[PDB]
Amino acid sequence: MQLNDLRSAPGARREKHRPGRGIGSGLGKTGGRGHKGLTSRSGGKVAP
Amino acid sequence: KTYTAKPETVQRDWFVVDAAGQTLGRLATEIARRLRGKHKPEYTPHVDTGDYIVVINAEQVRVTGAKTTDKMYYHHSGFPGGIKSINFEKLIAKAPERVIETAVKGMLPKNPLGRDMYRKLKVYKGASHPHTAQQPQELKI
Amino acid sequence: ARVKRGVIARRRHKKILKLAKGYYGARSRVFRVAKQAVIKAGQYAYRDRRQRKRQFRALWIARINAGARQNGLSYSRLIAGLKKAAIEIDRKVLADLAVNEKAAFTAIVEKAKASLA
Amino acid sequence: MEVAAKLSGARISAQKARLVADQIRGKKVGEALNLLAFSSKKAAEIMKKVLESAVANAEHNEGADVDDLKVSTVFVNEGRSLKRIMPRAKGRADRIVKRSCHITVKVADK
Amino acid sequence: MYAVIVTGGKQHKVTEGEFLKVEKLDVATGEAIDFDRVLLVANGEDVKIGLPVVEGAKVTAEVVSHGRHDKVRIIKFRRRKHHMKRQGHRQWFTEIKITGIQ
Amino acid sequence: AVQQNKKSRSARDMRRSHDALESNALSVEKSTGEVHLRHHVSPDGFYRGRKVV
RNA sequence: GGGGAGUGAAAUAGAACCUGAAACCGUAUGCGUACAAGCAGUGGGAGCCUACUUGUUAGGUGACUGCGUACCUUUUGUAU
RNA sequence: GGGGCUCAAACCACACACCGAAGCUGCGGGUGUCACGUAAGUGACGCGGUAGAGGAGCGUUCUGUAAGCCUGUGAAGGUG
């Protein structure tokens, strides 16, 4: 055990993919929201 | 790597064809084939490897069918209404040798090469040509 | 933890603008025109790796055709011998023998005038 | 030997000053000084005093003769412009640049 | 003397001292190899043409090196379609020097 | 009427290939040995071997 | 405003002064370019010029030629 | 499409060749999945792609590892 030698099991932490960082990340340009209509707008929520 | 021909060491020959009753566009295919050098195994597309073709009797060239009084030749002067036409038999009376040059010119490429292939084509009107120094040989007998 | 992105952005502009080296005008010196020009040059470079294999295949055939008609045979009659005979020799070296070793190319076109099919 | 003189900031622009620099480039000094003396330009008067100073730098800090010398490289760079306002019609104002230049003259005996 | 040999699913006109890159063949440096696929042998004016193959055939020359070609680059781009895809490639060669072809 | 496209610096400099300046016809007084414009009075005031001003 | 000389470890640290990038504007040099038509590149490719060592290299230029109507966004679809 | 073509370079049949795609085959290249392999290991079928889902990464700044390690015999930065 060193502080330089600790990591958790595979699958315990994930990368947290960020949307909208270029067109190779997979969430490019729109970030999983698609095109027009409210669901891609900010505050684009349908009430329960 | 493959062979590319090389325009400082290209061997070009001289040739007289005789258009004394030849079909116009079947003579022109053989001229424009040898002006590009398609008859040579070292044909390179970007190198002029062609020969020099002399044509001697360029007014005895012949078109079959009724193309002798048909087959108009159009060119536009650039000004409006400036379309200008001439048929086979009045052009072969006027300038008998731009007939057999415009057939070969349309069948060579539309490039600086095809504009240089064409400069190796010397057509004349008599039974003689002013190229006796280069000793052209006869072909398509 | 604020991070300034001037060192990474200039090295990323300098890669795309080194690949644009030799291009006319703003294609080699401003980034918005050089990024597009390096993308296009690598679309063409992809496309023309395929056409290089086509442009030489046409050039071989045209010289084999020109060197066979020297010996009194067309291209398509020369190639036709070899579903019946079998030289298994390709257009790349027959074009190289039509130009260079012209007597060993005459020996191949007489084996194809021996096939007669 | 190659002896320079520079003028950091002439109040002419560089395009109007390069048009005279191209006229004395490569010439002998005694004929370049005649060309600059009888020319019609501001830039000829400005670049005469730089070629006059470039020769005297070679006479005093070296051992050159004036007949030996030749205008080796003359070039005109761009200087710091100064930015001000010309007022136009209907309330809009425009930005005038008043350009400056860096005239350099080299001399050599070669 | 020159020969026409098949190595890498493609075939080479080969002279008796040539250095030439072919496709990667699974042999070590300084060894000798074996294809049986010599198609044409011409020595001066005695030209041998393979009836399928000039019989008595072996491709046994010596290996100079196992190298790798220059990087070509791949760009796959659909304009207006939010697609971009790049890839590098270096193709393995062997360099072989010609000593023995039969 | 404006540009739809900015001029290249190749074309910006092709235009000013006619803007190079010409030199003057200079000559030397035989008496004094000073350069002046041809057909003009010298900057000391000599003209064809004679002080005029 | 410079050319020296001094000062300093350094003055292309000289006061608009550490570093001093890019657009933009120059000078020098090598190669190309004044009968050739268009996204300006890419495949092929001669010649010329530099370094080197052998040549089946390395860098520059690229005559000539095949194919080739930018990019984003928006759309059933845009060289548009 | 142009040149141009008239016992055809047109049309109608038939025969035999050939060319032609990134198709197919030859040859060299990861793991995508799956089955086997006491897990070295080969096999087999795949591998165009927008919205979109999934999986894996690189690089930046900061803190711990770090009172460590590198560095004025030359850091970061900048240009090759």
XYZ file of C-alpha atoms (C1' of nucleotides) in Angstrom:
731
model
C 0.000 0.000 0.000
C 1.086 3.428 -1.125
C -0.992 6.542 -1.766
C 0.576 6.286 -5.204
C -0.816 2.734 -5.464
C -4.535 2.845 -4.662
C -7.337 2.439 -7.153
C -10.811 0.998 -6.940
C -12.209 -2.036 -8.754
C -13.065 -1.779 -12.460
C -16.650 -0.626 -12.762
C -16.682 1.280 -9.471
C -15.876 4.683 -11.002
C -16.855 5.817 -14.495
C -15.496 8.500 -16.774
C -18.463 10.939 -16.782
C -18.620 11.576 -20.504
C -19.253 15.256 -21.124
C -21.615 16.291 -23.928
C -20.676 18.664 -26.663
C -16.892 18.322 -26.796
C -16.369 17.774 -30.493
C -17.740 15.336 -33.001
C -15.615 12.332 -32.036
C -16.782 12.036 -28.456
C -20.111 10.620 -29.611
C -22.121 13.388 -27.959
C -20.994 15.985 -30.435
C -22.831 19.210 -31.254
C -26.087 18.457 -29.528
C -25.288 16.229 -26.590
C -27.899 13.514 -26.875
C -30.770 15.965 -27.320
C -31.364 15.743 -31.050
C -32.978 18.576 -32.965
C -35.721 21.172 -32.488
C -38.694 20.982 -30.160
C -38.759 21.645 -26.469
C -36.766 18.652 -25.155
C -33.545 20.158 -26.537
C -34.263 23.667 -25.199
C -33.001 24.755 -21.773
C -35.653 24.110 -19.225
C -37.000 21.820 -21.887
C -39.075 19.689 -19.611
C -42.461 18.072 -19.984
C -44.429 18.236 -16.753
C -45.154 14.945 -14.956
C 8.225 1.037 -60.420
C 6.781 1.302 -63.885
C 8.188 3.032 -66.933
C 7.399 6.670 -67.544
C 8.521 8.134 -70.847
C 10.623 11.164 -70.634
C 10.225 14.067 -73.026
C 13.886 14.860 -73.678
C 14.620 11.334 -74.984
C 11.496 10.620 -77.044
C 12.124 9.196 -80.519
C 9.681 10.688 -83.021
C 9.289 9.617 -86.633
C 7.913 11.372 -89.694
C 5.097 10.036 -91.834
C 3.175 10.947 -94.974
C -0.386 9.682 -95.258
C -2.283 10.168 -98.518
C -5.888 11.357 -98.307
C -6.735 10.661 -101.942
C -10.160 9.166 -101.379
C -9.983 8.247 -97.722
C -13.000 8.528 -95.480
C -12.550 11.654 -93.352
C -13.163 10.275 -89.908
C -11.546 6.909 -90.439
C -8.358 8.584 -91.590
C -8.557 10.943 -88.610
C -8.664 8.123 -86.056
C -5.376 6.753 -87.347
C -3.767 10.205 -87.455
C -4.860 11.139 -83.942
C -3.826 7.723 -82.653
C -0.270 8.234 -83.873
C -0.130 11.900 -82.902
C -0.611 10.807 -79.287
C 1.758 7.865 -79.642
C -0.858 5.240 -78.821
C 0.853 2.984 -81.372
C 4.056 2.906 -79.248
C 4.626 0.693 -76.190
C 6.078 3.640 -74.256
C 2.907 5.716 -74.471
C 2.787 7.870 -71.381
C -0.430 9.897 -70.935
C 1.310 13.104 -69.859
C 4.205 12.919 -72.358
C 3.926 13.690 -76.056
C 5.369 10.473 -77.505
C 3.575 10.864 -80.820
C 4.893 11.038 -84.350
C 4.777 13.698 -87.028
C 2.038 13.133 -89.597
C 2.084 14.861 -92.976
C -1.133 14.730 -95.020
C -0.738 15.520 -98.705
C -3.991 15.506 -100.714
C -6.273 17.085 -98.122
C -8.965 18.064 -100.668
C -9.429 14.556 -102.065
C -10.624 13.489 -98.614
C -14.124 12.057 -98.805
C -17.264 11.885 -96.686
C -19.752 9.113 -97.391
C -23.502 9.474 -97.551
C -24.857 12.897 -98.419
C -22.395 14.615 -96.067
C -20.607 16.342 -98.965
C -23.260 19.047 -99.238
C -24.517 18.537 -95.681
C -22.162 18.551 -92.628
C -22.205 22.195 -91.690
C -19.248 23.718 -89.810
C -20.251 26.228 -87.155
C -18.264 28.903 -85.359
C -19.390 31.942 -83.411
C -17.605 35.269 -83.824
C -18.533 36.520 -80.362
C -20.881 39.294 -81.370
C -24.661 38.760 -81.219
C -25.981 36.999 -84.272
C -22.425 35.975 -85.066
C -23.126 32.324 -85.791
C -21.382 31.378 -89.018
C -21.651 28.136 -90.951
C -20.010 26.487 -93.948
C -20.599 23.052 -95.448
C -18.118 20.388 -96.587
C -17.873 21.195 -100.283
C -17.546 24.974 -100.006
C -14.988 24.748 -97.200
C -12.953 22.159 -99.101
C -12.970 24.649 -101.968
C -12.060 27.618 -99.766
C -9.547 26.255 -97.251
C -9.337 22.561 -98.160
C -7.116 21.701 -95.234
C -8.927 22.986 -92.172
C -11.444 20.245 -92.915
C -8.957 17.479 -92.158
C -7.450 19.491 -89.302
C -10.707 20.106 -87.447
C -11.502 16.400 -87.539
C -8.185 15.491 -85.890
C -8.392 18.486 -83.529
C -11.692 17.299 -82.111
C -10.286 13.834 -81.495
C -7.095 14.873 -79.676
C -7.389 15.971 -76.027
C -8.522 19.458 -75.053
C -5.320 20.036 -73.106
C -1.947 21.703 -73.543
C -0.785 18.225 -74.619
C -3.527 17.867 -77.216
C -2.666 21.381 -78.320
C 0.926 20.109 -78.717
C -0.055 16.829 -80.374
C -1.812 18.964 -82.964
C 1.340 20.974 -83.728
C 2.901 17.790 -85.094
C 0.224 17.614 -87.798
C 1.162 19.311 -91.075
C -1.514 18.972 -93.730
C -1.046 20.369 -97.220
C -3.022 20.570 -100.445
C -0.841 19.589 -103.383
C 0.757 16.287 -104.203
C 3.882 17.555 -102.437
C 4.859 18.805 -98.999
C 7.699 21.064 -97.855
C 9.246 18.447 -95.614
C 11.591 16.513 -97.869
C 14.486 17.056 -95.458
C 12.941 15.037 -92.633
C 12.320 11.992 -94.930
C 8.755 11.079 -93.975
C 7.776 7.536 -94.863
C 4.524 6.368 -96.390
C 1.877 4.455 -94.428
C -1.751 3.316 -94.674
C -1.376 2.221 -98.280
C -9.195 25.033 -10.971
C -9.106 27.310 -14.005
C -7.205 26.140 -17.078
C -6.131 28.408 -19.914
C -6.125 26.813 -23.337
C -3.578 28.859 -25.265
C -0.797 26.255 -25.304
C -2.964 23.376 -26.512
C -4.821 25.459 -29.095
C -1.650 26.776 -30.678
C -0.130 23.333 -30.986
C -3.335 22.058 -32.531
C -3.463 24.917 -35.003
C 0.204 24.301 -35.826
C -0.336 20.647 -36.718
C -3.150 21.407 -39.146
C -1.210 24.310 -40.599
C 1.931 22.241 -41.099
C -0.128 19.739 -43.093
C -1.275 22.712 -45.206
C 2.292 23.615 -46.145
C 2.639 24.456 -49.805
C -0.917 25.560 -50.494
C -1.900 28.687 -52.383
C -2.718 31.798 -50.396
C -4.793 31.566 -47.247
C -4.970 27.786 -47.557
C -1.484 27.659 -46.055
C -1.578 30.575 -43.649
C -4.971 31.041 -41.908
C -6.490 28.237 -39.896
C -10.135 28.302 -41.025
C -9.078 27.829 -44.647
C -6.230 25.426 -43.871
C -8.320 23.107 -41.707
C -10.765 22.662 -44.583
C -7.918 22.278 -47.054
C -6.157 19.552 -45.067
C -9.444 17.696 -44.632
C -10.045 17.884 -48.397
C -6.502 16.801 -49.211
C -7.024 13.711 -47.075
C -10.361 12.931 -48.644
C -8.667 13.083 -52.042
C -5.711 11.087 -50.721
C -8.125 8.369 -49.631
C -9.966 8.402 -52.978
C -6.836 8.349 -55.106
C -5.260 5.390 -53.347
C -8.022 3.514 -55.165
C -7.612 5.293 -58.492
C -3.834 4.769 -58.505
C -4.584 1.063 -58.754
C -6.937 1.932 -61.631
C -4.771 4.459 -63.488
C -1.833 2.085 -63.658
C -4.100 -0.803 -64.673
C -5.229 1.303 -67.630
C -1.663 2.337 -68.489
C -0.353 -1.230 -68.459
C -3.186 -2.389 -70.732
C -2.640 0.508 -73.159
C 1.060 -0.335 -73.565
C 0.424 -4.062 -73.855
C -2.140 -3.169 -76.523
C 0.377 -0.935 -78.303
C 3.135 -3.536 -78.054
C 0.935 -6.408 -79.190
C -0.215 -4.659 -82.368
C 3.476 -4.419 -83.239
C 3.381 -8.223 -83.422
C 0.057 -8.503 -85.240
C -2.341 -9.166 -82.385
C -4.660 -6.998 -80.368
C -4.791 -6.682 -76.599
C -7.914 -8.773 -76.190
C -6.620 -11.552 -78.419
C -3.378 -11.653 -76.413
C -5.192 -11.967 -73.083
C -7.624 -14.508 -74.548
C -4.935 -17.175 -74.824
C -4.772 -17.674 -71.113
C -8.044 -19.225 -70.175
C -6.707 -21.846 -72.618
C -2.933 -21.585 -72.207
C -1.608 -20.385 -68.822
C 1.170 -17.838 -68.551
C -0.289 -16.363 -65.297
C 1.695 -13.210 -66.023
C 0.128 -9.885 -65.201
C -0.367 -6.528 -66.857
C 2.250 -4.836 -64.662
C 5.259 -6.769 -65.926
C 3.980 -7.283 -69.474
C 3.905 -3.516 -69.825
C 7.423 -3.406 -68.418
C 8.511 -6.049 -70.920
C 6.722 -4.356 -73.819
C 8.905 -1.279 -73.265
C 12.207 -2.641 -72.049
C 12.793 -6.301 -72.922
C 11.056 -6.143 -76.289
C 12.328 -9.517 -77.499
C 11.020 -11.367 -74.451
C 7.657 -9.728 -75.088
C 7.737 -11.044 -78.654
C 8.245 -14.519 -77.197
C 5.077 -14.167 -75.117
C 2.892 -13.009 -78.002
C 3.883 -16.046 -80.063
C 2.863 -18.382 -77.275
C -0.484 -16.582 -77.503
C -0.582 -17.006 -81.264
C -0.025 -20.685 -80.520
C -3.198 -20.890 -78.413
C -5.583 -19.802 -81.257
C -8.663 -19.628 -79.008
C 32.237 45.099 -44.396
C 28.561 46.057 -44.363
C 27.394 49.139 -42.489
C 23.757 49.962 -41.794
C 21.633 52.873 -40.766
C 18.035 52.641 -39.630
C 15.252 55.186 -39.234
C 12.719 53.865 -36.727
C 9.645 55.912 -37.509
C 9.359 58.070 -40.577
C 6.020 59.743 -40.905
C 5.406 58.345 -44.374
C 3.716 54.982 -44.848
C 5.737 51.952 -45.886
C 4.065 51.481 -49.275
C 4.841 55.065 -50.258
C 8.394 54.584 -48.941
C 9.114 51.224 -50.636
C 8.439 52.895 -53.951
C 11.671 54.886 -53.636
C 13.634 52.088 -51.907
C 13.126 49.962 -55.019
C 14.698 52.757 -57.062
C 18.059 52.898 -55.226
C 18.366 49.198 -54.416
C 21.627 47.769 -55.683
C 22.993 51.011 -57.102
C 26.268 52.758 -56.423
C 26.092 55.287 -53.618
C 27.185 58.335 -55.600
C 24.480 57.732 -58.172
C 21.894 56.762 -55.554
C 22.495 60.104 -53.842
C 21.927 61.904 -57.152
C 18.681 60.020 -57.699
C 17.394 60.832 -54.219
C 18.368 64.495 -54.523
C 16.391 65.209 -57.704
C 13.352 63.058 -56.954
C 9.927 64.472 -56.227
C 8.958 62.413 -53.174
C 8.983 62.819 -49.423
C 10.480 59.353 -49.226
C 13.441 60.418 -51.335
C 14.239 63.197 -48.886
C 13.840 60.910 -45.879
C 15.840 58.057 -47.422
C 18.533 60.459 -48.603
C 19.362 61.276 -44.977
C 19.512 57.582 -44.112
C 21.830 56.804 -47.016
C 23.830 59.918 -46.084
C 24.057 58.608 -42.530
C 24.854 55.049 -43.611
C 27.820 56.306 -45.632
C 29.167 58.435 -42.794
C 28.832 55.467 -40.448
C 31.055 53.531 -42.841
C 33.549 56.377 -43.214
C 33.927 56.975 -39.488
C 33.428 53.577 -37.853
C 35.228 51.761 -40.693
C 37.758 52.811 -43.308
C 35.564 52.954 -46.375
C 35.766 55.302 -49.326
C 32.566 56.706 -50.822
C 33.514 55.532 -54.306
C 33.907 51.981 -52.994
C 30.384 51.815 -51.614
C 27.162 50.378 -52.995
C 23.595 50.346 -51.686
C 23.521 46.746 -50.505
C 20.089 46.131 -49.011
C 17.475 48.813 -48.540
C 14.190 47.790 -46.984
C 11.218 49.534 -45.416
C 9.270 47.884 -42.626
C 6.001 48.950 -41.025
C 6.095 51.038 -37.870
C 3.662 51.756 -35.086
C 0.615 53.445 -36.566
C -1.278 56.020 -34.564
C -5.043 55.840 -34.394
C -7.429 58.758 -34.650
C -10.816 59.929 -35.753
C -12.151 61.667 -38.835
C -15.826 62.568 -38.327
C -18.140 61.806 -41.217
C -21.711 62.538 -42.211
C -24.811 61.636 -40.208
C -22.978 61.040 -36.960
C -20.678 58.173 -37.883
C -16.961 58.494 -37.204
C -14.146 56.714 -39.032
C -10.756 55.466 -37.903
C -7.748 57.011 -39.613
C -4.423 55.238 -39.295
C -1.378 57.420 -39.707
C 1.218 54.884 -40.690
C 4.947 54.977 -40.115
C 7.879 53.005 -41.420
C 11.343 51.718 -40.582
C 13.793 52.603 -43.346
C 17.064 50.662 -43.280
C 19.942 51.171 -45.730
C 23.022 48.940 -45.864
C 26.225 49.856 -47.701
C 29.157 47.677 -48.695
C 32.290 47.818 -50.824
C 31.525 44.599 -52.692
C 19.450 -12.886 -66.361
C 16.211 -11.640 -64.878
C 13.264 -13.470 -63.376
C 9.573 -12.903 -62.716
C 8.659 -14.228 -59.266
C 5.452 -14.120 -57.219
C 5.867 -13.261 -53.535
C 3.113 -11.203 -51.973
C 0.045 -12.006 -54.003
C 1.678 -9.872 -56.716
C 4.717 -10.326 -58.843
C 8.081 -8.734 -59.487
C 10.559 -8.526 -62.325
C 13.778 -9.362 -60.549
C 17.453 -9.002 -61.431
C 20.422 -10.794 -59.920
C 21.467 -8.105 -57.431
C 18.274 -6.211 -56.646
C 17.100 -4.852 -53.321
C 13.331 -4.765 -53.283
C 10.505 -4.448 -50.783
C 7.790 -7.098 -50.845
C 4.963 -7.950 -48.484
C 5.887 -9.231 -45.033
C 6.846 -12.896 -45.111
C 7.311 -14.835 -41.903
C 11.068 -15.339 -41.900
C 13.954 -13.943 -39.878
C 16.713 -11.552 -40.916
C 19.580 -13.162 -42.809
C 17.647 -16.360 -43.550
C 16.529 -17.809 -46.894
C 12.975 -18.244 -48.175
C 10.811 -20.480 -50.404
C 8.215 -19.754 -53.075
C 8.054 -22.110 -56.083
C 6.576 -19.518 -58.416
C 9.059 -18.303 -61.000
C 7.078 -17.308 -64.083
C 9.688 -16.158 -66.612
C 13.457 -16.601 -66.869
C 15.262 -14.738 -69.641
C 19.056 -14.858 -69.891
C 20.244 -12.785 -72.823
C 18.156 -14.178 -75.671
C 17.231 -17.523 -74.080
C 13.819 -16.670 -72.613
C 11.967 -19.308 -70.579
C 8.212 -18.792 -70.350
C 6.225 -20.603 -67.688
C 3.845 -23.146 -69.181
C 2.127 -22.499 -66.003
C 5.513 -21.950 -64.290
C 9.133 -22.547 -65.367
C 9.608 -26.028 -63.926
C 12.446 -26.476 -61.513
C 11.318 -23.544 -59.389
C 12.381 -22.117 -56.032
C 12.480 -18.552 -54.657
C 15.368 -18.695 -52.180
C 17.065 -15.333 -51.632
C 18.288 -13.617 -48.489
C 16.475 -11.157 -46.255
C 17.990 -7.731 -45.648
C 15.464 -6.346 -43.157
C 11.926 -6.318 -41.764
C 10.814 -2.722 -41.979
C 7.619 -0.695 -42.167
C 6.520 1.805 -44.814
C 5.734 5.464 -44.369
C 2.521 6.493 -42.687
C -0.404 7.083 -44.997
C -3.362 8.779 -43.350
C -7.084 8.113 -43.611
C -9.757 10.812 -43.431
C -13.419 9.869 -43.738
C -15.648 12.932 -43.788
C -19.311 13.340 -44.650
C -19.952 17.045 -45.109
C -23.021 18.509 -43.358
C -23.529 15.149 -41.614
C -21.499 15.549 -38.386
C -19.170 12.656 -39.257
C -15.385 12.633 -39.002
C -13.102 9.640 -38.709
C -9.319 9.371 -39.007
C -6.799 6.539 -38.961
C -3.105 5.991 -39.580
C -1.453 3.094 -41.338
C 2.084 1.829 -41.926
C 2.474 -1.249 -44.121
C 5.079 -3.857 -43.217
C 7.682 -4.840 -45.770
C 10.616 -7.164 -45.923
C 13.645 -6.086 -47.882
C 15.174 -9.045 -49.693
C 18.356 -9.166 -51.768
C 18.340 -11.471 -54.768
C 20.832 -14.329 -54.816
C 18.934 -17.554 -55.633
C 15.930 -17.914 -57.949
C 15.112 -21.059 -59.897
C -20.483 48.654 -55.287
C -18.343 46.383 -53.133
C -16.264 43.270 -53.256
C -17.979 39.973 -52.840
C -14.555 38.529 -51.965
C -11.409 40.153 -50.672
C -8.546 40.592 -53.105
C -5.691 38.168 -52.848
C -2.271 39.609 -52.184
C -1.230 38.067 -55.495
C -3.806 40.257 -57.241
C -3.252 43.240 -54.927
C 0.381 43.248 -56.072
C -0.375 42.544 -59.727
C -2.257 45.852 -59.807
C 0.759 47.790 -58.541
C 3.170 46.329 -61.079
C 2.689 49.582 -62.966
C 3.397 51.863 -59.998
C 7.205 51.699 -60.117
C 8.769 55.142 -60.375
C 10.887 56.522 -63.196
C 14.179 58.325 -62.864
C 14.983 61.846 -63.976
C 17.181 62.885 -66.860
C 20.248 64.128 -65.005
C 23.339 65.703 -66.521
C 26.539 67.433 -65.442
C 27.616 71.021 -66.066
C 30.852 71.054 -68.037
C 32.072 74.125 -66.137
C 31.250 73.362 -62.518
C 30.942 69.584 -62.610
C 27.671 69.395 -60.702
C 24.674 67.195 -61.410
C 21.391 68.930 -62.252
C 18.189 68.077 -64.075
C 18.511 68.137 -67.844
C 17.160 71.366 -69.413
C 17.006 73.015 -65.955
C 19.095 75.506 -64.007
C 21.638 73.959 -61.627
C 21.021 74.072 -57.854
C 23.846 76.652 -57.685
C 22.380 78.714 -60.514
C 24.419 77.725 -63.562
C 22.946 76.995 -66.959
C 25.076 76.069 -70.011
C 28.354 77.443 -68.720
C 26.988 80.666 -67.269
C 25.732 81.842 -63.913
C 22.169 83.012 -64.442
C 21.122 83.636 -60.822
C 16.297 58.285 -35.184
C 20.628 55.587 -35.813
C 26.422 53.528 -36.389
C 30.206 52.693 -32.838
C 32.415 52.823 -27.842
C 31.303 51.832 -22.865
C 27.758 49.206 -18.780
C 26.017 44.348 -17.544
C 25.852 37.568 -17.209
C 22.840 39.188 -21.267
C 21.401 45.614 -24.813
C 17.888 41.169 -30.759
C 17.427 43.259 -21.518
C 18.021 50.675 -24.068
C 13.406 52.621 -21.071
C 6.956 51.664 -25.976
C 12.405 47.821 -22.213
C 11.039 39.581 -19.510
C 9.112 35.891 -22.846
C 7.840 37.957 -27.655
C 3.220 33.598 -30.765
C -0.408 34.189 -34.886
C -2.821 37.048 -38.566
C -0.656 41.092 -41.485
C 3.680 43.551 -44.146
C 8.866 43.005 -46.056
C 14.189 41.722 -48.027
C 17.322 37.799 -49.696
C 17.832 32.989 -52.119
C 16.307 28.311 -54.931
C 12.614 26.548 -58.296
C 8.001 27.496 -61.115
C 5.111 31.007 -64.063
C 3.522 35.727 -70.062
C -1.293 30.011 -76.128
C -3.645 28.829 -71.126
C -9.855 28.338 -68.388
C -13.136 26.592 -62.975
C -13.038 24.820 -54.779
C -6.661 25.625 -56.264
C -5.999 19.923 -53.975
C -4.880 14.834 -54.823
C -2.894 10.278 -58.031
C 0.920 10.009 -61.659
C 5.340 12.823 -63.106
C 9.819 15.154 -66.209
C 13.356 18.837 -65.503
C 16.015 22.063 -62.340
C 18.392 23.472 -57.472
C 20.539 22.397 -52.581
C 22.756 19.176 -48.717
C 24.909 14.901 -48.399
C 26.765 9.527 -50.222
C 26.281 6.453 -53.754
C 20.987 6.103 -55.054
C 16.688 1.801 -55.807
C 18.072 8.379 -50.626
C 16.874 13.622 -48.022
C 14.941 18.606 -48.548
C 12.850 22.557 -52.136
C 10.198 23.681 -56.653
C 6.318 21.093 -59.625
C 6.280 21.648 -66.423
C 2.755 18.073 -68.050
C -1.500 14.940 -66.991
C -6.103 11.579 -64.552
C -10.008 12.528 -61.080
C -12.021 16.680 -58.522
C -18.681 22.164 -57.835
C -15.345 24.813 -50.026
C -17.368 24.619 -44.855
C -21.197 25.144 -41.264
C -26.281 25.148 -40.322
C -30.919 23.821 -41.872
C -33.644 20.443 -44.694
C -37.179 15.514 -48.617
C -33.104 17.542 -50.716
C -27.938 22.870 -51.180
C -21.778 23.753 -55.484
C -26.122 26.156 -54.435
C -21.429 14.454 -74.674
C -17.989 15.968 -78.883
C -15.092 14.644 -83.196
C -16.966 11.887 -86.507
C -19.303 7.360 -88.581
C -23.166 4.815 -94.189
C -21.270 -3.650 -96.926
C -21.220 1.201 -90.328
C -18.589 3.562 -85.401
C -26.575 2.487 -87.045
C -30.480 -1.221 -86.165
C -31.788 -6.959 -85.934
C -30.181 -11.699 -84.463
C -26.122 -15.403 -82.994
C -21.163 -16.775 -81.764
C -16.547 -15.772 -79.313
C -13.259 -12.652 -76.782
C -11.970 -8.316 -73.860
C -12.362 -3.849 -70.661
C -14.869 -2.086 -66.402
C -16.570 -1.027 -58.922
C -14.071 0.346 -52.924
C -18.050 -6.203 -55.758
C -15.046 -10.951 -55.593
C -10.185 -13.344 -55.088
C -4.895 -13.262 -53.865
C -1.413 -11.052 -50.187
C 0.024 -8.122 -45.570
C -2.787 -5.651 -41.246
C -6.816 -4.946 -34.594
C -9.549 -7.682 -31.580
C -15.771 -6.622 -32.839
C -18.498 -10.765 -31.224
C -18.698 -15.923 -30.238
C -17.083 -20.956 -29.414
C -12.880 -23.536 -27.879
C -8.086 -23.048 -25.645
C -6.267 -26.059 -17.553
C -6.768 -19.648 -20.709
C -0.901 -17.875 -25.910
C -4.302 -18.792 -29.777
C -6.011 -20.567 -33.107
C -10.648 -20.832 -35.616
C -15.709 -18.887 -37.564
C -18.587 -14.930 -38.952
C -18.704 -9.716 -39.113
C -16.545 -4.327 -39.233
C -20.989 2.381 -44.656
C -23.635 5.336 -41.347
C -27.402 10.674 -39.204
C -30.453 11.222 -34.763
C -29.363 8.071 -30.907
C -27.779 4.067 -27.108
C -23.268 1.382 -25.440
C -17.972 0.644 -24.600
C -12.778 2.487 -24.368
C -9.410 6.406 -24.216
C -5.858 10.989 -25.006
C -4.474 15.925 -23.538
C -4.920 20.510 -20.252
C -4.999 23.073 -15.054
C -5.128 21.994 -9.779
C -4.335 18.630 -4.956
C -2.125 13.992 -2.811
C 1.951 10.712 -3.701
C 6.104 15.540 -3.236
C 10.728 18.201 2.176
C 10.488 13.177 -3.498
C 12.569 13.545 -8.776
C 14.493 17.010 -12.664
C 16.685 21.845 -13.530
C 21.196 27.567 -14.117
C 26.236 21.887 -17.235
C 20.069 25.490 -18.176
C 12.891 24.920 -16.318
C 8.267 26.467 -18.347
C 7.464 28.867 -22.822
C 8.511 29.819 -28.110
C 10.406 27.972 -32.971
C 12.488 24.089 -36.011
